Design an enzyme around this catalytic site. Structure first.
Site, PDB file in Angstrom:
ATOM      1  N   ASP A   1       0.401  -7.664   1.734  1.00  0.00           N
ATOM      2  CA  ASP A   1       0.686  -6.276   1.721  1.00  0.00           C
ATOM      3  C   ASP A   1       1.934  -6.170   1.555  1.00  0.00           C
ATOM      4  O   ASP A   1       2.654  -5.072   2.316  1.00  0.00           O
ATOM      5  CB  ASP A   1      -0.074  -5.268   2.588  1.00  0.00           C
ATOM      6  CG  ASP A   1       0.065  -4.073   2.665  1.00  0.00           C
ATOM      7  OD1 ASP A   1      -0.128  -3.476   1.580  1.00  0.00           O
ATOM      8  OD2 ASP A   1       0.483  -3.316   3.829  1.00  0.00           O
TER       9      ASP A   1
ATOM     10  N   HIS B   1       0.830  -1.245   0.123  1.00  0.00           N
ATOM     11  CA  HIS B   1       0.102  -0.105   0.111  1.00  0.00           C
ATOM     12  C   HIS B   1       0.828   1.227   0.004  1.00  0.00           C
ATOM     13  O   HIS B   1       0.257   2.375  -0.307  1.00  0.00           O
ATOM     14  CB  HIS B   1      -1.044   0.132   0.985  1.00  0.00           C
ATOM     15  CG  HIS B   1      -0.516   0.256   2.509  1.00  0.00           C
ATOM     16  ND1 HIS B   1       0.013  -0.760   3.316  1.00  0.00           N
ATOM     17  CD2 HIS B   1      -0.182   1.237   3.133  1.00  0.00           C
ATOM     18  CE1 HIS B   1       0.367  -0.298   4.417  1.00  0.00           C
ATOM     19  NE2 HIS B   1       0.351   1.027   4.405  1.00  0.00           N
TER      20      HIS B   1
ATOM     21  N   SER C   1       4.797   2.340   8.207  1.00  0.00           N
ATOM     22  CA  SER C   1       4.428   1.215   7.313  1.00  0.00           C
ATOM     23  C   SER C   1       5.822   0.918   6.479  1.00  0.00           C
ATOM     24  O   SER C   1       6.320   1.702   5.319  1.00  0.00           O
ATOM     25  CB  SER C   1       3.248   1.633   6.260  1.00  0.00           C
ATOM     26  OG  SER C   1       2.102   1.376   7.279  1.00  0.00           O
TER      27      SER C   1
END
Lengths: 4, 281, 281, 257, 4
Positions: free
Chosen positions: D85, D55, D160
């Site tokens: 992901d 993402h 992230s």
């Protein structure tokens, strides 16, 4: 303070 | 070298922390136990007694306990205390049970590393670590006063009724509510409370013994002189003091407060002679 | 055995951090003193000098300092500094004062465990722990520069002005505020800043000495070489500049630390003019 | 006595944690150098491979990777996987790259102290401290196929793709997300998730090889006693190889959509 | 940015  | 880790305290204490589900009847339309609220609990001793929070098992039509090892049980509500938000469940095991390490001689210190063990948002058992931020707390908003232990170990919805343990795995407290959304200000970070184990241990015994906490009430609350009941109806005056309640001087008042509460109802006591009654609902 | 604990750091440092209250006379309509704001402070030496945040004592009519030992003092404002947001109070005490542990030869490191000491939400002194997350900090969107220490030790309203110490209880920084971000979409967790003790200490001595921090405003704002943001002033009244580089200022490779520290009122040789430093607005 | 510290884990690991910028093309005039999102990544080795979350680089026209040493590089998207992901990148850097301590023989335990290394709100590289809160979780999901490490180390937007290391500096996981919203009015605190460094490596090497991920008691919802040649699991099927037949005659292949 |  005291409230017993 | 080896990785710094509190996994020991985890192996020692976490097996004894369980999932508590507060089920209720027809939450949709048809009669059927719906899960109203979640929570945690701690297995105190081999008999199957479990401490959790009162707010967690209120209005429960059926309370279910789930062990970290897979077992599940319908638990009986032996009792609860509003003034401390403590409850006790009982489950009948036979294979034996994982119990929480308790060291009654240990005195918690501000700065001791702690682990919050519970079931946050029902994601399954989780451990979080902080320290004891403060002790002797929540006296700046006294209604049904109580003593608390403060911690910055992440406390989330679902952690209530759970355990606060030190690096050794010993029980330091029972995680209760979390200071959330002050007013309209913001979200407080790392402010969580727990009932100190000693107080939780004295309350459980009372709950196991009488099904409720029986407090010694007299009739003199003004927020040792009596500065503004059913006990003052035979011996007590108006604006006077009292060195000895039960004819024993407990210097201050807070001590006389607990001492009096610790006095079982009916027992005639010399303030004059007055007999104790049970604190009103 | 022995529980893991940072209590030793608490026992040595905490007695020295204070509850600071900002009280005003035009806060209620009866002109009686009322808290308009509150935060924390750190007693630096025995003369009664206490460091705190400027935004905590700004525009106060009375500043109250309360010690963990129960004593309360009215404090005098000796000086403050918008740039670092540091303020220095002075209580007049007798009988001695608890002072913050300082190790002027300790260099804070990213990863050092730290304890934040303060009065979040006026709950009373609370300790939280994390680590030093970063050094030389604060956004790429400055105005007046003064770099911070970043930490994930839970900081809340009330913690401002308080102490951030290591495990030996040594003073690492003065907590200043928890990044509450610029808008919405989420609440930042674990991002807090503190003024490094070395900087806090220098600034304090300057406020104690001169009652304010005298810097070096030569008159050359930009956005090295003369830049393009704003127009010059007394700085061009000796060295023609609107778009030209600058080699070394005051005989050293060219940096406003010296500039601000050069002592307004001294002709300085700037390579690539004989400009005389002036005091910031 | 010396101050208690995890600086060692910082010195050993942090240099290999980089800032990642996902730049796309926009209609503000011709702005094609605007950040879209940003995050972190981990230099896995001397060849220049970097792990990060999918993402964080999705729909990007350009990926910049910055190192704590100053260097910046245009990055090559080598592959990505929607199920974990995860995403691999590559930076053509000779002169040497700092790498993340790896120890495949280490089993992360609950209670283990950890540190999340990242770039929250693009404030710069930052270290946060916590412990391994749990293992083998679904995290934030409608229920897919993968287990996450849960941690109370604080992670925010910008974390992230970054590293979650232990006190020795050993990669434990790739920080993915932070338990979004809640039910009643309350913001959860201390609930973050990372992908176990083991899964992170299996998926990396796969992405590096096939330019992407090749994915192939027990009763169908009849009953299946076993699969291929071993007891019955819904996990092995993928680790076979599309076009492989096994007992009835069923032939497996790609896992699209 | 800066201002000296």
């Amino acid at each position: 303070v005291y409230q017993f | 070298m080896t990785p710094a880790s509190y996994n020991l305290a985890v192996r020692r204490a976490a097996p004894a922390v369980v999932n508590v589900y507060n089920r209720g009847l027809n939450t949709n339309s048809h009669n059927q136990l719906e899960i109203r609220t979640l929570g945690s609990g701690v297995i105190m001793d081999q008999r199957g007694y479990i401490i959790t929070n009162k707010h967690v098992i209120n209005d429960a039509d059926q309370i279910i306990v789930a062990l970290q090892d897979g077992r599940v049980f319908e638990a009986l509500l032996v009792g609860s205390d509003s003034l401390t938000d403590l409850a006790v469940l009982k489950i009948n095991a036979t294979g034996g049970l994982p119990t929480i390490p308790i060291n009654a001689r240990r005195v918690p210190h501000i700065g001791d590393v702690v682990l919050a063990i519970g079931n946050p948002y029902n994601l399954g058992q989780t451990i979080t670590q902080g320290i004891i931020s403060a002790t002797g707390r929540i006296g700046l908003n006294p209604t049904g006063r109580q003593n608390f232990l403060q911690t910055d170990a992440s406390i989330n919805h679902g952690n209530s009724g759970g355990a606060l343990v030190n690096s050794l795995g010993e029980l330091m407290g029972i995680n209760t509510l979390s200071f959330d959304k002050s007013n309209d200000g913001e979200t407080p970070e790392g402010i969580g409370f727990a009932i100190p184990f000693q107080l939780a241990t004295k309350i459980m015994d009372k709950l196991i013994r009488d099904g409720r906490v029986i407090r010694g009430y007299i009739g003199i609350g003004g927020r040792i002189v009596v500065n503004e009941g059913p006990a003052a109806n035979a011996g007590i005056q108006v604006n006077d003091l009292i060195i000895s309640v039960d004819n024993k001087p407990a210097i201050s008042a807070l001590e006389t407060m607990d001492q009096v509460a610790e006095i079982r109802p009916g027992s005639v006591i010399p303030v004059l002679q007055v007999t104790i009654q049970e604190y009103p609902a």
